[PDB]
Design a protein around this motif. Structure first.
Motif, PDB file in Angstrom:
ATOM      1  N   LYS A  14     -36.706 -17.909   8.190  1.00 19.35           N
ATOM      2  CA  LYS A  14     -35.799 -17.192   8.602  1.00 19.35           C
ATOM      3  C   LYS A  14     -35.833 -15.995   9.532  1.00 19.35           C
ATOM      4  O   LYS A  14     -36.863 -15.493   9.188  1.00 19.35           O
TER       5      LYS A  14
ATOM      6  N   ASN B  33     -37.068 -10.946  -1.714  1.00 18.53           N
ATOM      7  CA  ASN B  33     -36.347 -12.126  -2.077  1.00 18.53           C
ATOM      8  C   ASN B  33     -35.795 -11.914  -3.593  1.00 18.53           C
ATOM      9  O   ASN B  33     -36.409 -11.859  -4.411  1.00 18.53           O
ATOM     10  N   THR B  35     -33.571 -14.284  -6.321  1.00 17.27           N
ATOM     11  CA  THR B  35     -32.857 -15.558  -6.939  1.00 17.27           C
ATOM     12  C   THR B  35     -32.434 -15.286  -8.390  1.00 17.27           C
ATOM     13  O   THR B  35     -31.557 -16.099  -8.671  1.00 17.27           O
TER      14      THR B  35
HETATM   15  C1  LIG Z   1     -36.775 -17.217  -2.102  1.00 19.59           C
HETATM   16  O1  LIG Z   1     -38.157 -17.682  -2.315  1.00 19.59           O
HETATM   17  C2  LIG Z   1     -38.331 -19.146  -2.745  1.00 19.59           C
HETATM   18  C3  LIG Z   1     -39.674 -19.315  -3.168  1.00 19.59           C
HETATM   19  O2  LIG Z   1     -40.172 -18.489  -4.190  1.00 19.59           O
HETATM   20  C4  LIG Z   1     -37.843 -19.858  -1.599  1.00 19.59           C
HETATM   21  O3  LIG Z   1     -38.064 -21.347  -1.896  1.00 19.59           O
HETATM   22  C5  LIG Z   1     -36.397 -19.786  -1.257  1.00 19.59           C
HETATM   23  O4  LIG Z   1     -36.180 -20.314  -0.208  1.00 19.59           O
HETATM   24  C6  LIG Z   1     -36.236 -17.991  -0.883  1.00 19.59           C
HETATM   25  N1  LIG Z   1     -34.731 -18.072  -0.736  1.00 19.59           N
HETATM   26  C7  LIG Z   1     -34.202 -17.326   0.273  1.00 19.59           C
HETATM   27  C8  LIG Z   1     -32.655 -16.870   0.234  1.00 19.59           C
HETATM   28  O5  LIG Z   1     -34.639 -17.038   1.336  1.00 19.59           O
END
Ligand SMILES: *[C@@H]1O[C@H](CO)[C@@H](O)[C@H](O)[C@H]1NC(C)=O
Lengths: 50, 41
Positions: A14, B33, B35
């Motif tokens: 992205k 990132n 999560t």
């Molecule tokens: C954050 O990292 C994971 C891998 O650990 C990835 O799959 C995921 O798409 C990422 N999330 C974002 C919001 O980019």
């Protein structure tokens, strides 16, 4: 060879996404289990500037 | 980004039914990132 680019990923970066992670890329149905093999490859390549 | 507000209260059981808007404290160009998260106490 100090300069490299990622050649393989599960999906595109992205806008301004940064992704160092050194996982061996499974291209096919056979998992890498931490090493190269049948349809499995190291994630980076180099220009090797001459 | 981060925002906050503080208020006094009388009800102890759960959030008091009312309104009071939160105002910004921080913005950072982190690139990293998220999560998952956890509270510290
Ligand atoms: C954050 O990292 C994971 C891998 O650990 C990835 O799959 C995921 O798409 C990422 N999330 C974002 C919001 O980019």
């Amino acid at each position: 060879y100090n300069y490299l680019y990622r050649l393989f990923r599960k999906s595109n970066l992205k806008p301004f996404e940064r992704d160092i992670s050194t996982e061996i890329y499974q291209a096919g149905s056979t998992p890498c289990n931490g090493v190269e093999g049948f349809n499995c490859y190291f994630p980076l390549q180099s220009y090797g500037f001459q | 980004k981060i925002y906050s507000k503080h208020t006094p209260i009388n009800l102890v059981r759960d959030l008091p039914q009312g309104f009071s808007a939160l105002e910004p404290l921080v913005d950072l160009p982190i690139g990293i990132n998220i999560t998952r998260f956890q509270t510290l106490l």
